[PDB]
Design a protein around this ligand. Structure first.
Ligand SMILES: [Mg+2]
Ligand SMILES: [Mg+2]
Ligand SMILES: [Mg+2]
Ligand SMILES: [Mg+2]
Ligand SMILES: [Mg+2]
Ligand SMILES: [Mg+2]
Ligand SMILES: [Mg+2]
Ligand SMILES: [Mg+2]
Ligand SMILES: [Mg+2]
Ligand SMILES: [Mg+2]
Ligand SMILES: [Mg+2]
Ligand SMILES: [Mg+2]
Ligand SMILES: [Mg+2]
Ligand SMILES: [Mg+2]
Ligand SMILES: [Mg+2]
Ligand SMILES: [Mg+2]
Ligand SMILES: [Mg+2]
Ligand SMILES: [Mg+2]
Ligand SMILES: [Mg+2]
Ligand SMILES: [Mg+2]
Ligand SMILES: [Mg+2]
Ligand SMILES: [Mg+2]
Ligand SMILES: [Mg+2]
Ligand SMILES: [Mg+2]
Ligand SMILES: [Mg+2]
Ligand SMILES: [Mg+2]
Ligand SMILES: [Mg+2]
Ligand SMILES: [Mg+2]
Ligand SMILES: [Mg+2]
Ligand SMILES: [Mg+2]
Ligand SMILES: [Mg+2]
Ligand SMILES: [Mg+2]
Ligand SMILES: [Mg+2]
Lengths: 180, 61, 49, 176, 157
RNA sequence: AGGUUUUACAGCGCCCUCCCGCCCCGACUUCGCCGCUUGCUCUCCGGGGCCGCGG
RNA sequence: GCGACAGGGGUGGACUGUCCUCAGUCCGCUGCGCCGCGCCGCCCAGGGCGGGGGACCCACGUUCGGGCGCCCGAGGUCCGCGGCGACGCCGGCCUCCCACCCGACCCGUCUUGAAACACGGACCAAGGAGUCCAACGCGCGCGCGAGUCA
RNA sequence: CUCGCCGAUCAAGCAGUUUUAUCCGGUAAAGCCAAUGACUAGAGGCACCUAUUCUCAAACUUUAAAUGGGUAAGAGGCCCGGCUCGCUGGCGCUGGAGCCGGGCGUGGAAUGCGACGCGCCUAGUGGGCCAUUUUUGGUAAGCAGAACUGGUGCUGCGGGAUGAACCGAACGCCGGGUUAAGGCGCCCGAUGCCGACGCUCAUCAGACCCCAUAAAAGGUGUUGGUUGAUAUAGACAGCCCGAAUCAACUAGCCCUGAAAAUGGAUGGCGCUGGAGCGUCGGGCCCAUACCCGGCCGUCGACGGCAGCUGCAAGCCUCGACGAGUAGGAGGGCCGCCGCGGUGGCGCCGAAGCCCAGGGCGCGGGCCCGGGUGGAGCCGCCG
RNA sequence: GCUUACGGCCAUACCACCCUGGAAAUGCCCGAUCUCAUCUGAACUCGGAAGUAAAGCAGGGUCGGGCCUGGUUAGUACUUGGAUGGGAGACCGCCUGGGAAUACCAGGUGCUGUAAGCUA
């Protein structure tokens, strides 16, 4: 026999979108052809995110997309995001965005188009930019869910700052012995 | 091969000795099995890339 | 009905199963526990430069 | 030590490692009988290590070669001074043998000590081997072969080749 | 079961050497410990204030905080199967500067001068430590040191 | 201890030698007294078993 | 060539000893390293290396490239062949019966340990044990998105 | 999931391992003529006192290992300039720390490896047992309790006759070759070698890890060895004779010591120029182990594809790998009943049942044929 | 080289006895008005300068004790790892590495930083 541990032979990486969506699996059939033959590091990152789940594809608000486009060097590039571009109602101006995403909400689609912008899809992106040139791949706040506020050391340890699971946030709910 | 013979002959000619240079290459062969190995010895056999019985590697000395 | 009291037999094999990882030394170590007189001045050396 | 086959005589010389305090240290010569040179080097670092203060890591072996017999075609009377460790204590012992080569005479000592005294190879320590003349032999088992015009038959020749004919009609003769 | 006292088993480690008792020599008090230097830990039974725990006597950590009489050290202590960085407060009478990194700093300063010397001269001196190589081939002369015959000695009781 | 005392009616050692006085056999796998090996050992160089799946 | 030392003379002096203006101690060749030269030594052209004054070997001969073949060459083919072919003289090897060689203790369960002189089981058929509701957590699919669910 | 995938094009970092460098300790040993405590004997100086002496410590130690523990081996570095502060203060640098800019790869020990990187959810378990070494209580225990590591529990295989743990070695299905431990009189594969040397006779011989018992004490059984004493100025033995002899001790094999109950156990037969003991040589025998090749599957790829295929949820290429209870997960063109779709079958014979019939799948199972039966049944996507 | 002040390492510096030394300095020494001080001007504090080496101090001496260093003890004791090694057992031998301690023997005995002054 051979002295080797088979504990971590399997690499747990999603190699196929767990969704049975038809249009999403067609984009996978498109970017798998580019991840093999285009020889561009952009298509290899879009292919991963087409597999990822909804929690690994968080929304991207307009304000969080506008600020990343106003950085120096993003003059006439595209804002690629594998997910939904939600609207940020507490922002006012839209500076002529050129985005490309799977879904765009009805208000975000209106504010981008009314400002003269352009909204694309991942099939049009692979048509005009097969190498992925002139793109700015963005993402949303993956650690922005309420679920991550409960993850930590423990609610009852020093320097925890972890949100405990309670039925209702009140006075008689876990504030007596250990919180003072 | 002929140089080490030359150095050994000129040392015996004068009654002296010529100690050859210690070897710089070694061929290690694992002979024992893989069950019942000490953790300090098992770690070395993994660094020598000798994980199964009857396999050989070259080791710089 | 006595039992076995204490043992550390299989513990060393369980420790090195997932390895004994040293603490991750990160750049820019924390500043908790430092002298409060020293930290109060250091925060005054950052809001004036 | 295993004492496999014929024990060949090796002349192993060695010395301490030269330093700045003791440059060119003294050289020590040894008379080692071992089956191969790998064991002969280890036997050198066993006796020299207990006679002088020098280990294998503190010194080096300068020469280790075979010592052939000068007269392999002449019967000689050898005398071997040894000391073996029995189950009780260590005992000095002087045994006389008779062979053509000193490599085979010491080999007979390891076979004799193991047969008569049950001594293994690691307990025996050969100290002196000397070609003794036929006048200074103390053992009567060798002195009987010191008779010129020696004469003796080979009585009761036991049948070997007992399996070449395994079945036959003739019983073997033992008088020749 | 043993007692969980803080000084159980410290009969010999916190003791002082033979004929080395008395007051602490005043050189250990005038040593400057900056923030980020490697210091050793060696408790002393003379100063019962701020003495380290027996699980740190002989360990080594780096300084992260300096106070009037003591020094905050970051020591890595393995508890069961995990190594944890412990922030302890030990007075300067139980610690001393670790010379484990002084051999590295002296080696760097010698490397920074060997490359600037080879650059302005045009050589290829290698700046890298190497293990003890096998001994080269050398001649052993027997002009005045003839090989002396050794042999085992007889057994005497 | 051969010949009647040391070579004699056999031989066995050890020294100075006459250049190693001089030639011939090289661990004998090259004529079966004893070791280590290629410095890539050479052979349509022999014989036996096993199976050639795929495309 | 020069450095580490070995042995004595002349001058001054400090000290020591119950031999006392007598004794003694002390202060002011050989070894290694380093080079340079000469000579000699390494199947002998030194068979350690590089250059100069009869046959075997040269991926040297004037720069490559192009057609036809062979094959110790990207894992086998025969452009070799024989006897039988009428339900019988051929074929099935798994299943049926039987024989022999090797192996082979009875399952379930509790247990550190069960073939156990530990328990349950004579045999066969049918039935026979992780469910549904409320609520919670995490992962995933979907819809919309600072909204969402009527 | 975040990356590295492209190897030191790159920064790397990591390690049940060494090397270099620097610290930690008070165990083994040693010591007590050194301290504390215990302890024997004389001697000198007028019970003490001094210098010696014998013997010890786990809760004593001057000294002090081996093994071992921590840390350091670079860009998060090194060096230089400027600035900030309410802290510090003879000394706008007096310290200190922060901030900003610039200069400088010969990544500045060996070996190995994709990072056992960052999280989330989480079952089972919480009676363990055994061995080498260390070690406590006990006369001892197949006893009780600890330490390091391995094994086992969860594990089959070759060897030890037999076997939980011993030795060798860990396991997909096979052909060939070769070994480990152990063996080669016959059972029983292999010495059916003209194997080498010596020891040994047993009226209870002996026959090899764990291991299945044997001691003190003895022998003029026999074979070696050590140290001495006598002897042609003639010993020893014998009632003069003329060449060796005697004593002590030691170590091998054998023997005495050695007595239990159903008949019996080197495994059995049996073996004595051996089939015994000791030291060794050559050859040979086979494990699911090693090597070469075929096949299945899993895993990985810094992978290959928009005459034949392309059911891309498909096909093709390469390399490594395969034990497993408790438990977890995936796959199922495995099986049963019912529903919405869909594609059928049936009195020219449905379901069920039976079979020494023909076959498929690793398997769960399935298809076909024959017989029986007499009215319903099934495939695929959900 | 020496004498002082403050030290660093803390016996190579300590301990017993003997000998020698005062240029500066140091010490002893001479007084109790003030400051202070105790049973007591011994000490402590204060004022002072007749004497100059008895002691402190410094430098030497001792087949000195101690301490320090080296040799040796010894590759001994012990120990890492290994074996289907020996042995009834206790225990022992060997292979692979590391490797002490007393006794005994020999040598040595303070080094040095900052500041001030003197050439006995
Ligand atoms: Mg084993
Ligand atoms: Mg328990
Ligand atoms: Mg208990
Ligand atoms: Mg366990
Ligand atoms: Mg042996
Ligand atoms: Mg207690
Ligand atoms: Mg010189
Ligand atoms: Mg049960
Ligand atoms: Mg129960
Ligand atoms: Mg029973
Ligand atoms: Mg029953
Ligand atoms: Mg049923
Ligand atoms: Mg939960
Ligand atoms: Mg870095
Ligand atoms: Mg419990
Ligand atoms: Mg639990
Ligand atoms: Mg048992
Ligand atoms: Mg127990
Ligand atoms: Mg029990
Ligand atoms: Mg297991
Ligand atoms: Mg048995
Ligand atoms: Mg086979
Ligand atoms: Mg057998
Ligand atoms: Mg008797
Ligand atoms: Mg007798
Ligand atoms: Mg007599
Ligand atoms: Mg007996
Ligand atoms: Mg293979
Ligand atoms: Mg499996
Ligand atoms: Mg139902
Ligand atoms: Mg005087
Ligand atoms: Mg003295
Ligand atoms: Mg000493």
């Amino acid at each position: 026999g051979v002295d080797i541990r088979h504990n971590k032979d399997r690499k747990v990486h999603r190699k196929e979108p767990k969704s049975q969506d038809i249009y999403l699996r067609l984009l996978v059939k498109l970017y798998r052809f580019l991840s093999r033959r285009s020889d561009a590091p952009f298509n290899k990152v879009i292919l991963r995110r087409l597999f990822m789940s909804k929690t690994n594809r968080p929304p991207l608000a307009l304000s969080r997309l506008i600020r990343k486009m106003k950085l120096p060097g993003r003059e006439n590039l595209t804002a690629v995001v594998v997910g939904t571009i939600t609207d940020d109602v507490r922002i006012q101006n839209i500076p002529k965005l050129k985005v490309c995403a799977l879904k765009v909400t009805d208000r975000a689609r209106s504010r981008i188009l009314k400002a003269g912008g352009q909204i694309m899809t991942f099939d049009q992106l692979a048509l005009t930019s097969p190498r992925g040139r002139g793109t700015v791949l963005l993402s949303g706040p993956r650690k922005g869910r309420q679920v991550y506020r409960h993850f930590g050391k423990a609610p009852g340890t020093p320097h925890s700052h972890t949100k405990p699971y309670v039925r209702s946030k009140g006075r008689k709910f876990e504030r007596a012995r250990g919180r003072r | 091969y002929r140089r080490e013979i030359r150095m050994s002959r000129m040392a015996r000619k004068a009654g002296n000795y010529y100690v050859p240079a210690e070897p710089k290459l070694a061929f290690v062969i694992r002979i024992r099995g893989i069950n019942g190995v000490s953790p300090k010895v098992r770690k070395v056999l993994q660094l020598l890339r000798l994980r199964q019985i009857f396999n050989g590697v070259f080791v710089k000395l | 009905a006595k039992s076995k009291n204490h043992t550390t037999h299989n513990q060393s094999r369980k420790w090195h199963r997932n390895g004994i990882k040293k603490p991750r030394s990160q750049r820019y170590e924390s500043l908790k526990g430092v002298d409060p007189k020293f930290l109060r001045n250091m925060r005054f050396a950052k809001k004036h430069n | 030590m295993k004492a496999s086959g014929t024990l060949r005589e090796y002349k192993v010389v060695g010395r301490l490692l030269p330093s700045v305090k003791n440059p060119a240290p003294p050289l020590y010569r040894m008379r080692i009988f071992a089956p191969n040179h790998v064991v002969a080097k280890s036997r050198f670092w066993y006796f020299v290590s207990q006679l002088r203060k020098m280990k294998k890591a503190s010194g080096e072996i300068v020469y280790c070669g075979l010592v052939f017999e000068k007269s392999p075609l002449k019967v000689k009377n050898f005398g071997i001074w040894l000391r073996y460790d029995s189950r009780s204590g260590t005992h000095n012992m002087y045994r006389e043998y008779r062979d053509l080569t000193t490599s085979g005479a010491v080999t007979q000592c390891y076979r004799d000590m193991g047969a008569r005294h049950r001594a293994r190879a690691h307990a025996i320590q050969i100290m002196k081997v000397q070609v003794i003349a036929a006048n200074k032999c103390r053992r009567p088992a060798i002195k009987q072969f010191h008779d010129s015009k020696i004469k003796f038959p080979l009585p009761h020749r036991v049948l070997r080749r007992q399996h070449k004919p395994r079945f036959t009609t003739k019983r073997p003769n033992t008088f020749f | 079961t043993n007692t969980r006292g803080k000084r159980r088993g410290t009969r010999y480690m916190f003791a002082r050497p033979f004929r080395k008792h008395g007051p602490i020599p005043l050189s250990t008090y005038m040593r400057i410990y900056k923030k980020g230097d490697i210091v050793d830990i060696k408790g002393t039974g003379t100063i019962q204030k701020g003495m380290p725990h027996k699980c740190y006597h002989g360990k080594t950590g780096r300084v992260y905080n300096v106070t009037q009489h003591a020094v905050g050290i970051i020591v890595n202590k393995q508890v069961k199967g995990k190594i944890l960085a412990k922030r302890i407060n030990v007075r300067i009478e139980h610690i001393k500067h670790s010379k484990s990194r002084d051999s590295f700093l002296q080696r760097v300063k010698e490397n920074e001068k060997k490359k600037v010397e080879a650059k302005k001269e045009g050589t290829w001196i290698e700046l890298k430590r190497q293990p003890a190589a096998p001994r080269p081939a050398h001649f052993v002369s027997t002009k005045n040191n003839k090989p002396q015959l050794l042999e085992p000695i007889p057994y005497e009781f």
